[PDB]
Amino acid sequence: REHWATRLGLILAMAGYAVDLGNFLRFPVQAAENGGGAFMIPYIIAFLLVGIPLMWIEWAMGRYGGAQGHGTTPAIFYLLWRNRFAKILGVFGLWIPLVVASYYVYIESWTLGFAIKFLVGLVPEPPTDPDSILRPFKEFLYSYIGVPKGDEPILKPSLFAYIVFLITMFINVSILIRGISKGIERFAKIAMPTLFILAVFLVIRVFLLETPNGTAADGLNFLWTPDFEKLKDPGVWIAAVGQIFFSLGLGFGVLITFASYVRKDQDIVLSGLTAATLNEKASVILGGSISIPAAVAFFGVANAVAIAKAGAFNLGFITLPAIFSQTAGGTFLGFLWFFLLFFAGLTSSIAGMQGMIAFLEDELKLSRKHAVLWTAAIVFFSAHLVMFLNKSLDEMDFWATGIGVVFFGLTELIIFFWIFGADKAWEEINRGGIIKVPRIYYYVMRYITPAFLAVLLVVWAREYTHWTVWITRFYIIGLFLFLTFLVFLAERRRNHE
């Protein structure tokens, strides 16, 4: 079985997964809409009571399963809980990242395409007024995606967009086919430093932006000036718990897969805490210093609220590209921005596709080449639904991350810390640990963490159709059936040998 070569490589690979577009787009918009600097109060709380405890647990389950040659939850859940229902629940940890894969790598290709378009100058050049600058780029994105101009729910992606998606798929395979250390880990050691440099250069250049409408200081001001009156709102405390779950990539089964390549007695306590901390520093320092400040700098603090409400997606793919066409040397600026997002996405996507590669290797005994190619085949095939059927993406993302990760997140806790045994679980986490987990976390993991998660489930249920969503529901239901069949074939192949 493969292992991580260096402790640094392991941390950078784990961080590479956590850090993505959300760090530079989603988190800054979440903060502005939920109290500005005051949003850090429930965010740090959520980080301590939910994020950190669960990540350690997934790291432990990963290393525990990896010692016995299993990197995926269908096999690991069965080791923690000798039951048939444990194998079936495990299918979800194979299903969720695979559902995400169908739209994630595609959106990832958008950044690459946009980076190429910016570098070679194939971008709009307005013209005055805000809508006179934004609309030419609003149409640039819609022509790239193929946003329906009629009543039909049909997307018609450009040939360029489709080809870049092909190229993006290829790049992912290239890294994945070289394995864990010589592939994922090797790339982690290049991308993360490259990422940091790209970010810092943008942070510096954004801080020098000055327009008749405002400055970069106005951006950092609007974003971080606290509004504690919003702390009364339970929705803010829910968004904080949700964002942390989103930020670290919990409940995807990815961390478990990666942790399985950590050797039996190697540290996971300090290693996990370090990687988690990098992701957070990236969000508050790098992520919060670029997108929102640059936007507020150009349009003024008067439109700062309007900008935040327009969402993280509009900000990154419409607003900032418009601003770049109006700034000095913006054409190279746009390339760096989208190059930055691409590498951030590429280090997450190769991790999310590893779980399927691991299953095909560990349980069906396929070669790494075959495992990678068939995984790529499944993801590439599935993506045509996301590329051509409008709002299919929303439907996949809703089941997969809206409730799926949290439900699966709660499933991990109960299976590992309650069914497998809290005492056995606790010894598993701290074993080989450079530092020991604070004893107070024993109660947090066992009661506080699953309670917070269970609350998130209940609010989802109480809170929550055009016929085309049934197409997406049809297929993702089919995937779960197909993966169930593979798990079935796995346990049958094992009885023979």
Ligand SMILES: Fc1ccc([C@@H]2CCNC[C@H]2COc2ccc3c(c2)OCO3)cc1
């Ligand atoms: F809707 C969303 C929820 C959570 C997130 C996470 C946020 C932190 N960084 C990791 C993100 C998930 O990344 C993935 C996961 C599986 C994948 C993948 C990429 O490509 C193929 O299979 C992104 C989007």
Ligand code: NA
């Ligand atoms: Na993140």
Ligand code: NA
């Ligand atoms: Na990434």
